[PDB]
Every structure is written in structure tokens, then in C-alpha cells.
Amino acid sequence: MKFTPSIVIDAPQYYVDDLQLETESMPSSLKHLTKPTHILDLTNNDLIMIPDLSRRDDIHTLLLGRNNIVEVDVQNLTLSNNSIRRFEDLQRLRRALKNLTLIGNQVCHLANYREHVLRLVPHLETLDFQNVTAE
Amino acid sequence: MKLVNFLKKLRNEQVTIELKNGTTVWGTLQSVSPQMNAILTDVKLTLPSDNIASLQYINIRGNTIRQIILPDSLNLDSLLVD
Amino acid sequence: NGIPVKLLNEAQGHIVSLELTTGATYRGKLVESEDSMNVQLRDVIATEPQGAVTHMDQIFVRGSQIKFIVVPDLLKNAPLFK
Amino acid sequence: VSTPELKKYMDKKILLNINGSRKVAGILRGYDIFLNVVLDDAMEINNHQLGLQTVIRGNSIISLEALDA
Amino acid sequence: PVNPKPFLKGLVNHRVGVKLKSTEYRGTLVSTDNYFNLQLNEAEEFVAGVSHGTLGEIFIRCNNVLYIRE
Amino acid sequence: VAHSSRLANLIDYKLRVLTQDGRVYIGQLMAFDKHMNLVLNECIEERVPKIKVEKRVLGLTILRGEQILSTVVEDKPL
Amino acid sequence: GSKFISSSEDKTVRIWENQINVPIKQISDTASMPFLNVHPNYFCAQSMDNRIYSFSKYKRHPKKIHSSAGYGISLAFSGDGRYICSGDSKSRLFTWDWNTSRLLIPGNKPITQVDWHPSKVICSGAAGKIYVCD
Amino acid sequence: MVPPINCIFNFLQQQTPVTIWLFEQIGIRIKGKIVGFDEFMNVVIDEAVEIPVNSKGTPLGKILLKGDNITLITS
Amino acid sequence: VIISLRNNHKIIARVKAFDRHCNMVLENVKELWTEKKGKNVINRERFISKLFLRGDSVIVVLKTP
RNA sequence: AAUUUGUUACAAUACAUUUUUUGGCACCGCGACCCUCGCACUUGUGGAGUCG
């Protein structure tokens, strides 16, 4: 069940509680959404890598709950319950982002995980639903 | 008599359009209303010293369109016939 | 006749929001509307373009100077459209 | 086509918010289908009255917010 | 007794000046219509009371007009 | 997006909309007008202060055509 | 079927279906059709300026500008030039052309109407006389 | 009710000190006497006087000020 | 002929069409303006072959003999 | 073992001078502190004090 153009065209489309598309092993063929969504819900799928996106200027929210994200190739990124294991794997997020959630990922239990994210991704204001504070 | 008619007659033309706010708009006129509301396809919006933004379909309003820059080759007299 | 006009009329009674050309948003019970969006409203707050807010009783607004009107989402349901 | 229903506001003092961030006050005496206003005169908003009665053009009116309830 | 349109009609083949939505003008009136569009000869462009240039034969669009004067 | 002739034929499509003031209304066109006034189903006004996109969700909106500049298609139906 | 045949100065001949009330068939081949006659074969002979056709051709040089059909399949054609053009109906051949004597103007010599009995021919003429051709 | 047209007519009949405001133009005003009347707000006003507004007096002749740029009347 | 315009554009061009609204079809088109962010002084003009024009833009048309 | 005809209804095929399309265009939030533990459908939402 490839993420295909045909798949995207029959997918529930609605205004959420922003314009959101309701959605797989590999992220691909996003061209067909035509950059018309503010949010894309990819929860409960089997994606391994957050990569493969076309240029999408609209896209501001990515809900990627319960997948198998182990590597990273936009204002809000929800990655709860995935497979990121090393602090260094979170490095690509420095190039984006204000709301970040990485709970229920092995990486969470690494020593200094919170401080590492804060220094390497300073643009984040809320991390794991807690305010990044000055201290 | 009417320029509206002339406009209508101009179909499927890849043209630049200029607005009251100066925006240059490169697109194929698929249709135009009786009140000059331009309907373009294969559209390309550029400002008058900054980067470009392209779009598939744009319906621009008649009041906004200052000057429609016509095509290169065009027989005008013929067009002007009723 | 205009379906937006009809919608506006229907919204009579309801609490509509309403911005003008000036950019001064109002919210209030829509008392009366006309073909030209000549709205009257009750119990109406009035935001300034800069920020500050002011309560006021029975505002009238002329549709010419109105920009956009927000109606409650219940009217989406029925039964004007079909 | 239809008349602006301002019969509620007849013979009451109204803040005519007018073009260019200006104001007018005064008691409402009449109007027409173009929303021109005929009103017994008052000040321009510190403050200074001009005229005995005044006529405001339709186009110029932003708003006519009622001073009296 | 004197309405505007008749005054306008009378003032054909005579000197007039026009302000705009701003720059003053000065020229002899050729003809007028119901919409109050103008056609003038010996047009002089008074840029805030400064005759910048003398254009000659001109046609003023109605909506930009402010007032007429001798 | 499809290759339409008119606006009326593309009813209920998610629409980007520009207005003279510079705001951008986005939402599904429920109903059109003789004077291009638009009813929008789920309308979001998106504005840009003199930096980055400020955002406001409005709801069901009647939008006057005087102020409308131009409309663009954001996405397909549903 | 068609219960009414009609001929008009738009140079057409329509075959009508009356119950539904609309044209069953259109015959445009005429270049005003001023006369028709029904063969007593279920067909019609239609006329025009220079060409007399038939309908379920007839050789004509300019005869311009009525028709009558004998039971023997003889097809009469009255002229405005005063010439009486007789035809066979089957062929299209013209076996005779006559010229009437005007009266005691040369413009007034023509044939306005004509008919056969139920072996004789009766032609009203523009000269204020009826003539009987045997 | 007193319509606007009626008011205008009355003013014309009177010949009184009229002070006109300009649409989308704060700094300038006009002051004269109404002579003409039109179907629209346009009128002719002889012996007019242009005024710079208090945030003096300036010379001006006979004028018709166009109906679209009118705002206020008083007479 | 030359045309003055609301947006400070001196349109020197050959007229082809004409109507009630003073919209114009134009050939041999040569506009004149000044792209200039202050303090600066530049005078620019471009040739265009064929060009439609809207009437609200038009302030004053003129004819130089 | 769909086609044609008639009737009824709706939609499409006009114009510039105030309300739309002949334009008046152009040159609460962020530091601090503390209050409230409440079952809803929302302009907005604690309060004192400091910063913008």
C-alpha cells in the first residue's frame, strides 16, 4: 500500500479542529496534494524515514504518530512513538520549527536529551509539551 | 464598438497582465468575463525586483487589471470586426 | 439575486463578525441587512486596527465600506443552498 | 433599490463616522436610497460646531453609530 | 436658476482650469458631455500653481477631476 | 488542479483568495455572485506584517468582491 | 404518411407529420417552389423557376416561371412566358411545347392555373380567358 | 422626513453661507453660496473660497465642485 | 499620442481601439516612469509591441503634432 | 425469445456619474510573582508589577 496519487485523491480532506489531509512504508508522490494543505496526518503507518517531500510551501503541521521513524532526511512536528535512538539522528531538525514532540522514542532516555535538543534546535519553543525556558 | 467583445474573441493566448498594484502576470487566457474578469491557466506571478511565484489557475478580477499585454503576432483589424 | 446576500439575511439574529476597509472588526447580533450589505448590529464590540477595543450599542455599517463578514457555522447546514 | 431602514434612528443624535478617519455628530432629520444623511447640526471630533443643519453624502459614510440607544 | 450642466455648456470655447485627485490645469474648453469628461486646447499644467509645461490639445478623464474654474 | 472554464464550474474547491489590503483568505467556495462576492465554508485569513505569516481562523465567511483581487485553487474537494 | 406536402418561397418543400405536428422530411433541392401536383404512383411533382423536379428530374431549359398530372402520366407545365411545356412523367422527356395566342399585351400572356378532368385540359390565363386544350 | 434633494433645493432658494468638505482630503475645505442643482450631488457654487483647515484665507473664484468629491454641506 | 495615468506612467503609443470607458488597444507602445527608492534619480522606459489598457488608469490623453 | 412529437418548470445567450467591475491610486506579546480545581460549545478573559 504505496502512498500513491490515487491514494491521496480519495483521502478524507477536511478543516480540522487548518486544512488537513487524512493519511504506508515510504513517503512519496506528495506532488498530487498540490500544496493545498496546512496539515498532513500520517499517524499509524509504517514509515521509516521522514524524507521524500516535494516543495510544499503550505505545509505547517506534520502529525507522524505511531510509525517507525528511525531517521530524518514547517512549524509543528509530532513524532510521538517512533524509533529515533541516537541524539545525532535528531541533528537534521536544526535546519528547519516551533513545536516539537519526540516522546516515546528511545532517544528520550539518553543522558542530556532535552538539553541536546535545546542547543541544537534553538528555534523550538515547546518541546515535548513543555516550554523551553531560559535557564 | 465594444472592447469587451474583442477581449472575448482573444482566446487561449499566452499573455502578460499588469495590475493596479503593478504585479506582472504571465499566463494563458482561457476565458474572460463580460466585465473583464480574466481567467488564466499556466500562470506565473512576478513583482515589478523580487523572486517569482508560479501557479496553475488564476481568476483575476476586472477592476484590478490595468493593462493586458497582448501576444506578439495578432491581426487587430480582423478582431475588431463584428 | 446574490446567494451571499441571502446568507447574510439569514444570519439575521445571529452574532456575526464584521471587518471594514479601515480594518476595524466588529462582532454583534445582526439586526438588519439589505441587498447592498447595509448591516445593522446590536450589543457590538469594536476593535481598532491597532489593537484597542470599545463596546457600543447599535452600529450601522454601509456594505461599500465593509470588507468581509463572518457568520456562525450553524448556517452552513441549511437550507438556503439546497 | 430598497430604502435604508433608518426609521429607528430618526430624530436621534448619531456619530456619523465619515471618510478619512474623521467624525460628525448630530440629530437625524432625513435620508435617501443612496444613504445621504440630513441632520440638525453638531461638532466635528477638542471640538467645534459648524452649521445650523448639515447634509452628509452617501459615499462618505463609514458608519453611523447611534449615540442615543 | 443656473444649474451646472447649462453653465458647463455656456463655458464652451472659453478659458477653464481643472484640479485633480493633485495638479492644476489651464486651457480653452472645446466641448463637454453628461459624464463631465473634458477636451481642452492650449493646456498648461499648473503643478501647484507652477506652469510646468504647455501640452496644447488634451482630453481629461472625468473621475480624476476635482473642480472647474475661470 | 483541473483545467476549468469558469469559477462557477469549480464550486466547493478549496480556494486561496487575495484582497486589496494584502490579506489572504483561504477556504472552500460555497457560493459565487454577479459581483464576485464569495461564500467560504472554512475560511482562514492569513496576513503578513512588515516578516512571517500571521494566521486567523474565521469560519463561514461572506467576502465582498470589491475588496477581492484574485482567487487561486489551494486543493481538490472533500 | 405525410398527410400534408407544402412548398414555400424559402425554396424548400416539407413533408409533414401532422399527428406529432412537425416536419417528417425536408426537400431542399429547389434553388421559390410555386406549384405542386400529386400524381393520381403516390408521388409529387414540384416546380421552380427553371427546373421541374419530381419527388417520391425533368429536362428544362429556362421555362421560368402551375403543374397538372393526367392519369396517363402526362405532366403539364404552364409558363409565364406563355409556353405550355408538356412532359412525360416517367422519363423527364419534354415531347411538346406550345405558345398561346395572347388576345385581340404580350406581357399578359401566361398561364395562371390548370387542371385535367376526371382527356381534356383547362387553363385559366392572365389574358382574362379560360382555354380548353384537347 | 427631509430628503437631501429637498434640503439642497432649500439652500439654493436661500443663498446662504455653505461650507463644503472634500472626500479623502482633510486639509482643504470650500466656502461659498449654492447656485446649481443636479440629479447627483454635483452643484455650481459662485463666490467660492478655498480654506486650509486648522490642524487663514486663500483667493478663489466661481466654481462647480464635482459631486463625487463632496462630503459635507451646511445652509 | 501620449497618455497620463494614475500610477505615474506616461504612455506614448499608437491607438487602435476606443470605447465608452476609454479603454484602449495600443500598438507601438512606449511607457515612461521612474523606478526609484529614495533618494535616487532614474528615468526608465520600455517598448512593447501590442498592449491593452484599462480606462480608470487614464487621467489625461494628449496629442503632440 | 432506446428514438420521435406535444405541454409545464428552471438556467444561459446591454453598457461607465455615491453600495461592488471604470477604483482615492501612488511616492495583545515576553521575564518575574500569585489567584482560581471549575462539565463546555467561545469577540476577549486572573490579578500586581516590569518589558516591548
Report the 3 state secondary structure along A48-62. Answer: CEECCCCCCCCCCEE
Residue F76 contacts A where some CB pair is shorter than 8 Å: yes
Tell me the three cell numbers of residue G109.
Answer: 400572356
Contact I50 B48 (CB under 8 A): no
DSSP string, H23-67: TTEEEEEEEEEE----SSS-EEEEEEEEEE----------EEEPG
| CA–C1' gap, F51 and J51, in angstroms | 22
Please tell me the experimental approach by which this structure was elucidated: cryo-EM
- Nearest CA-CA distance, residue B31 and chain F, Å: 7
Return phi, psi of residue E48, to 5°.
Answer: 60, 45
Give the three cell numbers for residue A15: 478543516
Query: Using CB atoms within 10 A of its CB, is residue A119 exposed (0-12), middle (13-18) or buried (19+)?
Result: exposed
Assigned C-alpha cell, D9: 434612528
Sign for the pseudo-dihedral over CA of B18, B22, B27, B32: negative
In chain H, residues with a C-beta closer than 8 Å to the C-beta of E70 are 61-62
Is some CB atom of chain F closer than 8 A to the CB atom of C66? yes
How many domains in chain C? 1
Residues whose CB is less than 8 angstroms from the CB of residue F57 and which lie 6 or more positions away in sequence, other chains included: A18, F42, F43, F44
SS3 for I53?
strand
Note whether D36 and D9 are within 8 A (CB): no
Residue B60 contacts F, CB cutoff 8 Å: yes
Beta-carbon contacts of residue C51 (< 8 Å; ≥ 6 apart): none
Verify whether the Cβ–Cβ distance C69 to F31 is below 8 Å.
no
Side-chain half-sphere exposure of E57, counting CA atoms within 13 A:
4
* Interchain CB distance below 8 Å, E59 and I65: no
**Are H43 and H65 within 8 A, CB to CB?**
yes
All three cell numbers of D60, joined, read 462618505
Q: Specify whether the backbone of G98 is left (phi greater than 0), alpha (psi in -120 to 50) or beta.
A: beta
Helix (H, G, I), strand (E, B) or coil at B19: strand
- Rg of chain D over Cα atoms, rounded to whole angstroms, equals 11
CA–CA gap between residue B67 and residue E21 (Å, rounded): 21
Could you tell me the sign of the dihedral formed by the alpha carbons of C18, C24, C29, C35, in that order?
negative
Instruction: State the Cα–Cα distance between residues A42 and A53, nearest whole angstrom.
Output: 13
Beta bridge pairs of residue A78: A63, A101
Say if residues B61 and F70 touch (Cβ distance below 8 Å): yes
The answer to whether the beta carbons of residues I1 and I64 sit under 8 Å apart is yes
Residues of A in contact with F73 (CB under 8 A): 34, 36
* Range list of H helices, chain B: 3-9, 76-80
Which strand ranges, in their side-by-side order, compose the sheet holding G121-125? G115-116, G121-125, G129-133
Q: Do E64 and I59 touch (CB under 8 A)?
A: yes
Q: Which long-range contacts (CB under 8 A, 24 or more apart) does C47-55 make?
A: C48/C24, C49/C22, C49/C23, C49/C24
CA distance I65 to chain E (A): 9
Instruction: With H, G, I as helix, E, B as strand and everything else as coil, classify residue H6.
Output: helix
Cβ neighbour number for residue I65 with a 10 Å cutoff: 4
Q: Which residues of chain C neighbour F32 with C-beta distances below 8 Å?
A: 3
Instruction: Indicate the pairing of strand I2-5 with strand I58-63.
Output: antiparallel
Provide the sign of the torsion angle of the four alpha carbons B63, B67, B73, B74, taken in this order.
positive
Best probe of the F interface among B61, B65, B66, by most F CBs < 10 A, is: B61
For domain E1-70, the question of CATH label 2.30.30.100 is answered with: yes
- Residue-number span of the structural domain to which I37 is assigned: 1-65
Please tell me the distance from the alpha carbon of residue G81 to that of residue G63, in angstroms, as a whole number.
Answer: 7
Q: How many angstroms separate the CA atoms of F28 and F43, rounded?
A: 7
Residue C50 neighbours by CB under 8 Å, 6+ apart: none
Q: Burial, A67: exposed, middle or buried (Cβ in 10 Å; 0-12, 13-18, 19+)?
A: buried
The answer to whether strand J lies under 7 Å from the CB of residue I27 is: no
- Give the other-Cβ count within 10 Å of F51's Cβ: 6
List the domain boundaries for chain A.
1-135
Cα A56–A61–A63 angle (5° rounding)? 115
Asked if E67 contacts H65 with a C-beta cutoff of 8 angstroms, the reply is: yes
Of G123, G97, G129, nearest to G111 by C-alpha is: G123
Strand ranges, E, within chain B: 13-19, 24-32, 38-46, 53-60, 65-69
Query: Three-class SS of residue G23?
Result: strand
**Contact assessment for residue G25 and residue G17, using Cβ atoms and an 8 Å cutoff:** no
Q: Closest to F75 (Cβ–Cβ): which among A12, A18, A33?
A: A33
For H70, which DSSP code? B
Cis amide bond preceding G65, omega within 30: yes
Q: CA-nearest residue of chain C to D69? A: C57
Write the burial class of residue G78 (CB in 10 Å: 0-12 exposed, 13-18 middle, 19+ buried). Answer: buried
Q: Are F76 and F13 in contact (CB under 8 A)?
A: yes
Instruction: Give the nearest nucleotide to H5, CA to C1'.
Output: J18
Q: Distance of CA I42 to CAs B18, B20, B47, I34, I46, Å? A: 22, 22, 19, 6, 13
Q: Which residues of chain H lie closer than 8 angstroms to E63, CB-CB?
A: 68
Where do breaks (C to N over 2.5 Å) occur in chain E, by preceding residue number?
Answer: 21
| Chain A residues with CB-CB distance to F26 below 8 A | 19
Give one DSSP letter per residue of A68-113, joined into a string: ---EE---EEE--S-----GGGGGGGGG---EEE--SSGGGGSTTH
How far CA F35 is from CA of B62, H50, I2, in Å, comes to: 10, 39, 33
Nearest to I50 among B22, B65, B71 (CB): B71
Domain extent listing, chain H: 1-75
Q: How far does the CA of C52 sit from the C1' of J45, in Å? A: 15
d(CA E14, CA G87): 85
Q: Which of E2, C38, E22 has the alpha carbon at shortest distance from H69?
A: E22
As a whole number of angstroms, the distance between CA C76 and CA F59 comes to 10
Grid coordinates belonging to I24: 484602449
Q: Does H38 touch chain E (CB under 8 A)?
A: yes
Q: What are phi and psi of C64, to 5 degrees?
A: -50, -55
Q: Is residue B7 within 8 Å of B36, Cβ to Cβ?
A: yes
Distance between E8 CA and the closest CA of chain H, angstroms: 9
* Helix, coil or strand: residue I4: strand
For domain H1-75, give the fold.
SH3 type barrels. (2.30.30)
How far is the C-alpha of A40 from the C-alpha of A70, rounded, in Å?
A: 19
Collect all residues of chain F within an 8 Å Cβ-Cβ radius of residue C76: 30, 41, 60
The residue behind cell 481643472 is E18
Report residue B19 CA to chain centroid gap. 10
CA–CA gap between residue H22 and residue E65 (Å, rounded): 13
Q: Is B81 on the interface with I (CB under 8 A)?
A: no
To which residue does cell 491607438 refer? I15
Q: I17 and B74 in contact by Cβ < 8 A?
A: no
| Cβ atoms of H74 and D41 closer than 8 Å | yes
Alpha carbon separation from G109 to F25, G32, G86, G87 (Å, rounded): 85, 21, 17, 21
CA of B62 to C1' of J37 (A): 58
Give domain limits for chain D: 1-69
Say if H60 is an interface residue toward chain E (CB within 8 Å). Answer: yes
3-state secondary structure of I26: strand
Is the distance from CB of F61 to CB of F41 less than 8 angstroms?
no
- CA–CA separation, B54 vs B27, rounded Å? 10
* Contact criterion met (CB < 8 Å) for F75 and A18: no
D60 lies within 8 A of chain H by CB:
yes
Give the CA dihedral H64, H66, H69, H75, nearest 10 degrees. 50
**Alpha-carbon gap, residue A77 to A123, rounded angstroms:** 13
3-class SS letters over F17-44: EEECCCCEEEEEEEECCCCCCEEEEEEE
Strand order in the sheet with G53-55: G36-38, G44-46, G53-55
For chain D, say whether C57 makes contact (Cβ under 8 Å): yes
* Residue E58 grid coordinates: 488634451
Counting Cα atoms < 13 Å in the Cβ hemisphere of D57 gives 20
I25 and B49 in contact by Cβ < 8 A? Answer: no
The length of chain G is 134
Q: Which residue bears the cell 491557466?
A: B41
Greatest CA separation for chain B: 42
Tell which D residues from 20 to 49 touch H, by Cβ distance under 8 Å.
20, 22, 24, 29-32, 36-38, 41
Question: Kind and range of the H or E element at F68?
Answer: strand F68-73
- Which strand J nucleotides have any atom less than 7 A from protein CB atoms? 4-6, 14-28, 31-32, 42-43
Q: Cα–Cα distance between G110 and G123 in angstroms, integer?
A: 10
Q: CA triplet D25, D28, D32: central angle to 5 degrees?
A: 120
Residue A59 near residue A51 (C-beta atoms within 8 A):
no
Residues 32-51 of F with CB under 7 A from strand J: 33-37
* Three-class SS state of E53: strand
Rg (CA), chain E: 12
Q: Is the CATH code 2.30.30.100 the one for domain D1-69? A: yes
Q: What is the CA radius of gyration of chain H?
A: 12
Cβ–Cβ gap A58/F74 under 8 Å = yes
Residue type, H39: E
Q: Are C72 and C24 in contact (CB under 8 A)?
A: no
Pairing state between β H25-34 and G74-78: unpaired
DSSP per-residue letters across G37-79: EE-----EEE--SS--EEE-----SS----EEE-TTSEEEEE-
Of G82, G86, G104, G103, the C-alpha closest to G95 is G86
Range of the domain at B32: 1-82
Bridge partners (DSSP) of residue G131 are G123
Tell if B22 CB is < 7 Å from nucleic strand J: yes
What is the distance, to the nearest Å, from the Cα of residue D4 to the centroid of all Cα atoms in its chain? 13
Find the Cα–Cα–Cα–Cα dihedral B26, B30, B33, B39, rounded to 10°.
Answer: -50
Q: How far is CA I16 from CA B5, B66, I42, in A?
A: 15, 17, 31
H53 close to H38: Cβ distance less than 8 angstroms = no
- Kindly determine whether the C-beta of residue F56 is less than 7 Å away from any atom of nucleic acid strand J: no
